[PDB]
Design a binder for this molecule. Sequence first.
Ligand SMILES: *[C@@H]1O[C@H](CO[C@@H]2O[C@@H](C)[C@@H](O)[C@@H](O)[C@@H]2O)[C@@H](O[C@@H]2O[C@H](CO)[C@@H](O[C@@H]3O[C@H](CO[C@H]4O[C@H](CO)[C@@H](O)[C@H](O)[C@@H]4O[C@@H]4O[C@H](CO)[C@@H](O)[C@H](O)[C@H]4NC(C)=O)[C@@H](O)[C@H](O[C@H]4O[C@H](CO)[C@@H](O)[C@H](O)[C@@H]4O[C@@H]4O[C@H](CO)[C@@H](O)[C@H](O)[C@H]4NC(C)=O)[C@@H]3O)[C@H](O)[C@H]2NC(C)=O)[C@H](O)[C@H]1NC(C)=O
Ligand SMILES: *[C@@H]1O[C@H](CO[C@@H]2O[C@@H](C)[C@@H](O)[C@@H](O)[C@@H]2O)[C@@H](O[C@@H]2O[C@H](CO)[C@@H](O[C@@H]3O[C@H](CO[C@H]4O[C@H](CO)[C@@H](O)[C@H](O)[C@@H]4O[C@@H]4O[C@H](CO)[C@@H](O)[C@H](O)[C@H]4NC(C)=O)[C@@H](O)[C@H](O[C@H]4O[C@H](CO)[C@@H](O)[C@H](O)[C@@H]4O[C@@H]4O[C@H](CO)[C@@H](O)[C@H](O)[C@H]4NC(C)=O)[C@@H]3O)[C@H](O)[C@H]2NC(C)=O)[C@H](O)[C@H]1NC(C)=O
Lengths: 208, 211
Amino acid sequence: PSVFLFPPKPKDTLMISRTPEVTCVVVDVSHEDPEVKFNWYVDGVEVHNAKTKPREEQYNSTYRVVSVLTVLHQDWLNGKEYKCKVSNKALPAPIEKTISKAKGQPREPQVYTLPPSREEMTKNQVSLTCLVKGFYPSDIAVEWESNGQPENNYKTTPPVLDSDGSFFLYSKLTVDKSRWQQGNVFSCSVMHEALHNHYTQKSLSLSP
Amino acid sequence: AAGGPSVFLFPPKPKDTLMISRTPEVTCVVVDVSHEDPEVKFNWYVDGVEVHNAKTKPREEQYNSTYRVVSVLTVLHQDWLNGKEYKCKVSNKALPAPIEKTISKAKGQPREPQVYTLPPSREEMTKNQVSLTCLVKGFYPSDIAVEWESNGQPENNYKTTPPVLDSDGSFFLYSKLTVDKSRWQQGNVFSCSVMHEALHNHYTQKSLSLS
Ligand SMILES: *[C@@H]1O[C@H](CO[C@@H]2O[C@@H](C)[C@@H](O)[C@@H](O)[C@@H]2O)[C@@H](O[C@@H]2O[C@H](CO)[C@@H](O[C@@H]3O[C@H](CO[C@H]4O[C@H](CO)[C@@H](O)[C@H](O)[C@@H]4O[C@@H]4O[C@H](CO)[C@@H](O)[C@H](O)[C@H]4NC(C)=O)[C@@H](O)[C@H](O[C@H]4O[C@H](CO)[C@@H](O)[C@H](O)[C@@H]4O[C@@H]4O[C@H](CO)[C@@H](O)[C@H](O)[C@H]4NC(C)=O)[C@@H]3O)[C@H](O)[C@H]2NC(C)=O)[C@H](O)[C@H]1NC(C)=O
Ligand SMILES: *[C@@H]1O[C@H](CO[C@@H]2O[C@@H](C)[C@@H](O)[C@@H](O)[C@@H]2O)[C@@H](O[C@@H]2O[C@H](CO)[C@@H](O[C@@H]3O[C@H](CO[C@H]4O[C@H](CO)[C@@H](O)[C@H](O)[C@@H]4O[C@@H]4O[C@H](CO)[C@@H](O)[C@H](O)[C@H]4NC(C)=O)[C@@H](O)[C@H](O[C@H]4O[C@H](CO)[C@@H](O)[C@H](O)[C@@H]4O[C@@H]4O[C@H](CO)[C@@H](O)[C@H](O)[C@H]4NC(C)=O)[C@@H]3O)[C@H](O)[C@H]2NC(C)=O)[C@H](O)[C@H]1NC(C)=O
């Protein structure tokens, strides 16, 4: 009976309206004995606002069981540690796992939008590029929007270690050449802990 | 022998397979050859046919007090690019049966990358350093080589992202070259070179300069 501990999603830790959650999912719990207790700790203290979802049989007839702990944005961003502690009857030792935010002095990313190259204008789909460089540590969120809705067709590289010890990444958003040619404005939104309000937005549109 | 000698098979480097003036090599490396049983025999096979052009290196002693033997098979660019299988067979009397390893190019229909160069953002023109971007878009499979040069010489203060899987099943990546604002101001020309099996001549080069 083995444990997996998942951290809150970056964007949930960065925007205070959202709810960051730490997840403790126990997998491979027998029919034999299947009951399982969850106790949660922040810097070694007992918390009791965990919402635990009932046992779930897979096809592996083996049961999965999830305890979700809601956390405070500042506690996570300040580096506090979260331990999940699981008590099954199916092994003597109640067994445990910790996580916390990755360490490192925050570095503020620079965000730059780049129009498509003139060679791509022969195609009827074109690429809009968002470059995010100089950030540390690497937990980040990047998204594209237009006129207040999210834009589907994009993909973001994973962070890449630059020469100066900071990270960079690129996000490519693909759109119809027509929408670009009509002067539609597209925004790159970036969320990172070293930004003011943890948020910035840079716009991009067909220039005159 | 540690838990017996063990074998590792290394493919050629992509660039060597793609430029025909370079020499692509498959390398078979055997480690943990005991002092009691120090002889090792390589047999090479390409699509199940033995070849005899391999170049076997002496036999070098490691600090664990145990041997390392390397054999090097030169391969044909087009044989590798056509998907042929390379097979190393290693015999040593510390082993009950000979060990064999197989290697070959990543499979799948090739697709040609498009290469676009993007100048630095106007907002970056405040800083001392600016970023020149090479977008390489739509390629399959993912083995690729991307380099930056200026006046024939490499630049090397650049980083390439790994291939990212795109929505249409192909890959793309970006290559970022960081340059002194002054060299970009002077009109210095920079060039992104790409090597990939679906390019004409396996090669292309896109240039950008100021204005
Ligand atoms: C019975 O069948 C079920 C059915 O589930 C199956 O799920 C997938 C994999 C498909 O096969 C489905 O078709 C199928 O239905 C089995 O359930 C699976 O069990 C395995 C093993 O127990 C788990 O694999 C582990 O995965 C986690 C990370 O998984 C996330 O991403 C998965 C995509 O691959 C996704 O499917 C998962 O749902 C999970 O998603 C997370 O969900 C949480 C909460 O819901 C959420 O917060 C997140 O949004 C989301 N996160 C992500 C990233 O998507 C991982 O823990 C495991 O990796 C460990 O082991 C490797 C060995 O080293 C290593 O590569 C990893 O780094 C990690 O290793 C540990 O890492 C750290 C250091 O970094 C350290 O603590 C440790 O020292 C180190 N080493 C070890 C040994 O721990 C592994 O990849 C599946 O996730 C799980 N599926 C689901 C849906 O839960 C079940 O196991 C079967 N029973 C049997 C065989 O008995
Ligand atoms: C005794 O000593 C010897 C000699 O080692 C040297 O001397 C001692 C005294 C120390 O000082 C050492 O530090 C020193 O290295 C030991 O021999 C070592 O044995 C281990 C295994 O026990 C081998 O590990 C394998 O490593 C390869 C990658 O190795 C490259 O990179 C190393 C640097 O990181 C470098 O040291 C190697 O020389 C080799 O370098 C490459 O060389 C080629 C040509 O020679 C060159 O073209 C390349 O440019 C160059 N590259 C680099 C980066 O330098 C690794 O691939 C293996 O991983 C596979 O196997 C693992 C299990 O064995 C598995 O966990 C992995 O996931 C991985 O699995 C593979 O996955 C791929 C992809 O999916 C798949 O295609 C494969 O089928 C699959 N293969 C397998 C087997 O599953 C592996 O980790 C060391 O290379 C080797 N060292 C040397 C120098 O040869 C020995 O261990 C010592 N024994 C005792 C008892 O002490």
